Symmetry: D3
Subunit: 151 residues, 6 copies
């Protein structure tokens, strides 16, 4: 299940804030593997289809707006239990609740300014990933050490 994959976006702040590598490096060092990845400017349109569930939801409005407001880091990571796991590294959605050593616990404060999103699960993963990527953008390759990360 080591081929599990999750979608991680470093949000507009993430980006202005200068936490790009930092974040990426946490995943790298934990042992997961970047499958896909590009720097973009989510479309309004996308943000809307991405954020559709939670559409008619106050916040909404301006989520897109800010989400749209800047370039983000679209990323796909691979590994055993990344969805779960990446969600921990992340921290709680509201930074108020995240803790030290997590991503958001360490560098952010407030919810509307969350620095990053991770899929909430495989079902999600799939959708977003599908929704965010093109088949080709995904890249098959193997580690220099699948052996020391997994048995």
């Amino acid at each position: 299940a080591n081929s599990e994959r999750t979608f991680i976006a470093i949000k507009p702040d993430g980006v202005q804030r200068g936490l790009m590598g930092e974040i990426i490096k946490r995943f790298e060092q934990k042992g997961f593997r970047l499958v896909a990845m590009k720097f973009m400017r989510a479309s309004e349109d996308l943000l809307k289809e991405h954020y559709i569930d939670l559409k008619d939801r106050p916040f909404f409005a301006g989520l897109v707006k800010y989400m749209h407001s800047g370039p983000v880091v679209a990323m796909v990571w691979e590994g055993l239990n990344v969805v779960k796991t990446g969600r921990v590294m992340l921290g709680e959605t509201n930074p108020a609740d995240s803790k030290p050593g997590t991503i958001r616990g360490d560098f952010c404060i407030q919810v509307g300014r969350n620095i990053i999103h991770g899929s909430d699960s495989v079902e999600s993963a799939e959708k977003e990933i599908a929704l965010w990527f093109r088949p080709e953008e995904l890249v098959n390759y193997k580690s220099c050490a699948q052996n020391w990360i997994y048995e």
Copy 2:
């Protein structure tokens, strides 16, 4: 209400131990604003009122001595729920119980050499701040990050 402030000092142990740059580094990193700070040797007087409610603690004159046994770094940091948050960053009063990822957590073993203090509550913060600093010393300014951290 992103004006809440907190008092934080860095014990002699922190100082002697070289932990400034890192302590500071974590608050700069999470996003809070340094409103004042100086590096001094606090007086027994100062310590004694700072540590007033613990005057009936046997530790109490131990603290007071060691807390005056070398330079310390006083500071006020501000931001939204910066008093709770800071605490959490801090670790727990007893290092024994502070989670890795917390200052206390990676850096200190014991209660009496627990390198740092941060306010316990906003009233306490008002106090200590008043105690430690002249209002003048506190720097009123705006953050570049400002809009990126805050909604």
Copy 3:
């Protein structure tokens, strides 16, 4: 003139080395804006095209080779003097003369496995980008600290 660009690429071994957020960090922290970024497999055509000046020399398709055996992180970083400075950051072309502080002087040992590549002139630069990115991938945005980095 804060507009100059450079093309940075993370060679397939630096990715394999879990050196991406690390090097991406060096950039960001130096002050550079990220224009465009992608993770991917370089094609033989692109690569050939890319290494064209040296189509004869020995090392050649051993280049193309390696160069196409894994993913790279392809990037475009902006800023005053990106191209010469980038350079100086990567350090020299053969790791061994690379100096402690540079990417290469810090992480890699031999010329043939030298984690990354940066355009060596704007000239090259201009070409490198042209070749590697569609234009719809250059991102147009203003930084948080434009006016902290520049006079």
Copy 4:
């Protein structure tokens, strides 16, 4: 009681992972004195002896196995409460429940490849050392900041 000891070992994958100075760092920065350290190949006898409590369970010689396929960094770290605290630093035994801040929560994903090991009682502790080090390898010295770490 600042004398308690613990036995830490860097499993052959964490070495393979270039995680040694990293984890050694976590210790040192937390405040612990290093009593004894060695790099080496664990023998089958030692290892068998070492994993004795579990000679039956499945995972068993797959332990012994891995465990003898590479070098480990064998260490003894001193200090108040090394053994429980060490623990809390490594994080849980299965990486996935390991938390961001711990060695395991930061660097590793699966139980079977979990970078390191620490004695889980002083009891174990005492045995672990006894087994792994000759006595002529425990180093007797006083720290620079004995009296900054301890009351």
Copy 5:
């Protein structure tokens, strides 16, 4: 003569940019002793005398403005050839020319946003120190590290 001191301030750019903890962190790291430090907004008066010899520089009122455009961190650090050394750590006046590994080096692009100042010479240090600090503010103490850093 391990008493030599130097003045170092951290520009508004450094401050706004979050580089305190790191700047401090490098001096704590190399081994020098922080003798005083405060965080203030310097006055044009202050800046103007500080920057006196450059009063005939066109940059001069640019500096003066920006140097007063936000809080700064003044400090005196001491140790053996701390004035030359510090400089070297610093980087070069022009970031363009400062070697990776230097503060200037990893962190700043341009001459007018070059985040930091450190004394050019001991006479200059005496001056600036006098300028910036009241003698009282400077902390006289001894280092734990003391004998470890010094013969």
Copy 6:
């Protein structure tokens, strides 16, 4: 020549200072491989045979003395050109001359308090290594990536 090996000792200060991992991690991340390694207390005797050339040399006297004065990190590293290379990472013997990004440039100040030694060359390597180690202490094994470090 990728089997070249050099002797690196983290000196008594190195040790009290808490730079153990740090240093080790520079070698790890640069790509070299630890062949041998133990924490010890050099004998006077050893220090004498080690430091014999430069015997009847003022300094001498007390070099042993301090060298002897504390436990050190005996280490053996492997890689292409480690002798040379490790010597750069190191910095100049006198820290006064080392630069930022080097080991000693970054963390030490004065010569008698040098934090570490590296062999000055293959001839040296051999001798010290021989002199410091027992055949068995050396450990043959191969990387999880000799492939991405060397071609």
